[PDB]
Amino acid sequence: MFKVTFKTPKGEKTIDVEADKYLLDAAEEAGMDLPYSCRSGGCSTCCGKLESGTVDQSDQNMLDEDQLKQGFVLTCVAYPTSDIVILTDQESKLPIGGSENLYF
Ligand code: FES
Structure with a gap:
């Protein structure tokens, strides 16, 4: 199966993830309570x-x-399509942007 290294705030581990299992679900099943809300993209x-x-x-x-x-x-x-190294809890990094903050 693919091997996915999950790098979380609390540590890292590497687990099997099937091609038809979403990352979040695999991580949860391996004891990592990754962030989520809507669960639907x-x-x-x-x-x-x-x-x-x-x-x-x-x-x-x-x-x-x-x-x-x-x-x-x-x-x-997200389904894995290869072996992966992924950082979790990265929402801060995603710029807010918008029509009123155009950076000049
Ligand atoms: S929890 Fe994944 S897009 Fe909302």
Whole structure:
């Protein structure tokens, strides 16, 4: 199965994840209470960030192309597609942005 290293605030561990199991679910089953809210791809609570490897997160409904290229992942709807190293609890890192903060 793929091996996924989850790097959390409280430590790291590496676990098996099947191709048809979402990251969040695997992590929870291995004792890691990762953040989540909606569990359906429509918020940023579960965001993680890929150090290495790939996911299938086609049901994600938050992230733009930039953000995807930066390795952001909605862990509640992400299947592994390779061995992975992922940082959890990364929502701070996602810029708020908006139409009133245009950075000049
Ligand atoms: S918990 Fe809302 S997108 Fe994952």
